[PDB]
Amino acid sequence: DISDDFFALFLDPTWVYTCAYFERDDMTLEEAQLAKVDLALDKLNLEPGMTLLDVGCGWGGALVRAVEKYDVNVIGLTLSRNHYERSKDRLAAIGTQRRAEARLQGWEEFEENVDRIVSFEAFDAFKKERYLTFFERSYDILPDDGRMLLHSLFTYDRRWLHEQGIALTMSDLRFLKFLRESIFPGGELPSEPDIVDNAQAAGFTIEHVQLLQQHYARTLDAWAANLQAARERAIAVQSEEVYNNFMHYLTGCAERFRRGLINVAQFTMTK
Length: 271
Ligand SMILES: Nc1ncnc2c1ncn2[C@@H]1O[C@H](CSCC[C@H](N)C(=O)O)[C@@H](O)[C@H]1O
Prior knowledge:
Pathway: Lipid metabolism; mycolic acid biosynthesis. It is an enzyme of class 2 (transferase). By secondary structure, this protein is an alpha/beta fold. Helix content is 46%, strand content 17%. The chain contains 11 helices and 7 strands. It has helices at 4-7, 29-42, 61-70, 81-93, 131-141, 158-163, 170-181, 192-201, 213-229, 231-237, 240-259, and strands spanning 51-55, 73-78, 100-104, 116-120, 147-155, 205-211, 262-270. It has a 7-stranded mixed beta sheet with strand order 3-2-1-4-5-7-6. Strand 1 (51-55), helix 3 and strand 2 form a beta-alpha-beta unit. The structure holds S-adenosyl-L-homocysteine. S-adenosyl-L-homocysteine binds next to strand 2.
């Protein structure tokens, strides 16, 4: 796949690779990623010593933030070995008496009780045949007053787009195919009902939905600006083909968030 050394060229030091939250207009990318993590974690009412599960933990930035700021025990799951390795190393380098572990393990295999769950843009990598199963499992491992913050992309169909004044162009269709044909997220996104209806069928209440559509446009712009500024190094680490593909993905996604063709939101999920 793609080396960490490539992503290092355009991500901030948290390594967070999901929609940031520019809670103040003048935050840096790193401040906005920490703000996004805190925005989610604040909704979980974490007390020191609870155990937080991060489903799809990436390179571990949210787990690290959870330990440092919220003083919780943490378990992170990922299917990526590179994500696991960096999460493992970063968590072991935190000085904490709490338990902090990363695992190369799917949520499908995880059955331990935890106090709270967070997940940032893992849900779109799940097969649609697992949407309900995911919420059922999440419900089962939470306590009676547990909470889950699901941060997920989602898409709109033609009918909804049109009522909002938006059309899918021939270009957008080719872009979707480009996303599916390469190694990028966004080709098989859930609908909002896919999230909400399956979560409710599993027993969750949707307490709050916070849309972050334009924050993702800004996030993607920043990643693209960073990658372009490091173009020579990116080509050296991977290739010009990969570099141009990533720039197409970053700028193309940014355009479509700005246009409103897709969205991203934090769903506060209670029992
Ligand atoms: N079934 C599954 N169980 C656990 N992790 C999964 C998963 N399917 C995908 N993932 C993980 O979800 C992550 C999606 S990328 C998002 C990374 C991180 N949450 C961030 O905010 O930057 C990857 O680590 C991927 O391996």
